[PDB]
């Protein structure tokens, strides 16, 4: 039985980058050929492994992390990057063994008047550790006076929305991203 | 004749932060008392000069730089700051002699459905030098292939709009900012 790469790549709805969606793939035959013939991906970049020798090695688990970001910040998905989507939403380790795949989804994620269902974390006290997610919506104390959940002056709500519309530039349109991290440990 | 501080502070429309508006005030009696009684300012911070001894010193020119930013980035208007409004839109020197004044203008700059007339520069090749403005709208080559004004993939339009609406948080609402820099040179 082939590993499911049509329920991760061809799914109906993707998760926001702050609450990204991790799926552990195991106990199957990893048929990555589905990613070699697909001509929609705008980025297929492999770190650690060669992008054609993914079949040769046998791994314990393959974690597919899927989310939706903008076109400007697809480059922030890589080892040793900084930004708003690289230390507050999704952080990759400095020694990463996996592959990042990103393709334009303006025709799925952008509706008339704006699709404000895709949020991203703008404020956070400290940078994320690799492969950590934060789904908290607590008020960010950006000043010097405790907020206690009122969201006023110098107390901002962290989760800012994405203004995706079909008229945006190709660099401001929604890109769907899937990060396949290959995890190998001492086990079958 | 009192120096004009009602055509800078009480003007009808403010300029965007990227194309900020500089007015040189000279040949008048600097009556800063209008700024001591005004109770609307949320920030009145003076660097170099004491905020009450502004009358005692006699300066050659007073440059009032007015613009509109968001509430999150009013703190980026200060000597030795970094961000998107501190090295791409408006940069203050490390040895600054002046005063920054900022007040909330949600009831003037935010209309129903959004006031997208206030732009800010998001992309730039190099950081601004102190007291420099850039009003160019050339396409930003963020990739490795020259754009030549097409605005496609990895070629972004720098000027991004502000989504000001009356429902935003007090930290996401439009703040009007006026920076009075005191310039003294050997002259009357």
């Amino acid at each position, epitope marked *: 039985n082939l590993c499911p790469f049509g329920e991760v790549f061809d799914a109906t709805r993707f998760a926001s980058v702050y609450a990204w969606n991790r799926k552990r793939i195991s106990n199957c035959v990893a048929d990555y050929s589905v990613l070699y013939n697909s001509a929609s991906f705008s*980025t297929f970049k492999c770190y650690g*492994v*060669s992008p054609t020798k993914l079949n040769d090695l046998c791994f314990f688990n393959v974690y597919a992390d899927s989310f939706v970001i903008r076109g400007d910040e697809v480059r922030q998905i890589a080892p040793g990057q900084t930004g708003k989507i690289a230390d507050y939403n999704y952080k990759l380790p400095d020694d990463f063994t996996g592959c990042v795949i990103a393709w334009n989804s303006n025709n799925l994620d952008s509706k008339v008047g704006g699709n404000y269902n895709y949020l991203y974390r703008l404020f956070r006290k400290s940078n994320l550790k690799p492969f950590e997610r934060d789904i908290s919506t607590e008020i960010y104390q950006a000043g010097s006076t405790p907020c206690n959940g009122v969201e006023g002056f110098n107390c901002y709500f962290p989760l800012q929305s994405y203004g995706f519309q079909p008229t945006n530039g190709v660099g401001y349109q929604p890109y769907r991203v899937v990060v396949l991290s290959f995890e190998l440990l001492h086990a079958p | 004749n009192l120096c004009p501080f009602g055509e800078v502070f009480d003007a009808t429309r403010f300029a965007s932060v990227y194309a900020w508006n500089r007015k040189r005030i000279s040949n008048c009696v600097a009556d800063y008392s209008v700024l001591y009684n005004s109770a609307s300012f949320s920030t009145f911070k003076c660097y170099g000069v004491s905020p009450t001894k502004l009358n005692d010193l006699c300066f050659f020119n007073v440059y009032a730089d007015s613009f509109v930013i968001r509430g999150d980035e009013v703190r980026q208007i200060a000597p030795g700051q970094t961000g998107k409004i501190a090295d791409y839109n408006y940069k203050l020197p490390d040895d600054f002699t002046g005063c920054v004044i900022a007040w909330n203008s949600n009831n003037l700059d935010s209309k129903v459905g959004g006031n997208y007339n206030y732009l800010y520069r998001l992309f730039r090749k190099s950081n601004l030098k102190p007291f420099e403005r850039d009003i160019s709208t050339e396409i930003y080559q963020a990739g490795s292939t020259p754009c030549n004004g097409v605005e496609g993939f990895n070629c972004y339009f720098p000027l991004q709009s502000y989504g000001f609406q009356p429902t935003n948080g007090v930290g996401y609402q439009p703040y009007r900012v006026v920076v009075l820099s005191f310039e003294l040179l050997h002259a009357p």
Partner: nanobody
Framework: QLVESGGGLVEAGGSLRLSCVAS????????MAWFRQVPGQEREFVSH????????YYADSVKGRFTISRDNAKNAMYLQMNELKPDDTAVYYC??????????????????WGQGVTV
């Protein structure tokens, strides 16, 4: 960032050796490539070499002629050209990216880029 050397008028049948040194990166985690651009046409792809050096790819017009290689003891890569027909005179760019793409032909898959070589 990416300095490069070599290039110049040849005797149309001899050899040449372009080289590309990196001066701000580890060069042990960076996959390198060589592109070529002629004025009046898009930038072509010359060759590509992943980490270590055992994984090399060449264009379908310079296969067999050019030899790509890399040396980590001085942070350099080399494109040894051996035929130099009168149709490959162009600017030659050196590119380096942290990862190894399946579309190694695409110039958008390389973050850092070097200067240009003589035409």
């Amino acid at each position: 960032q990416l300095v490069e050397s070599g290039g110049g008028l040849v005797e149309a049948g001899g050899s040449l050796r372009l080289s590309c040194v990196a001066s701000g990166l580890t060069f042990s985690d960076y996959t390198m490539a060589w592109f070529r651009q002629v004025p009046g046409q898009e930038r072509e792809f010359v060759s590509h070499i992943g980490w270590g050096g055992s994984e090399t790819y060449y264009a379908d017009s310079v296969k067999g002629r050019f030899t790509i290689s890399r040396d980590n003891a001085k942070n350099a890569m080399y494109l040894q050209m051996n035929e130099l027909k009168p149709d490959d005179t162009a600017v030659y760019y050196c590119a380096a990216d942290r990862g190894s793409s399946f579309y190694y032909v695409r110039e958008s898959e390389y973050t850092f880029w070097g200067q240009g070589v003589t035409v």
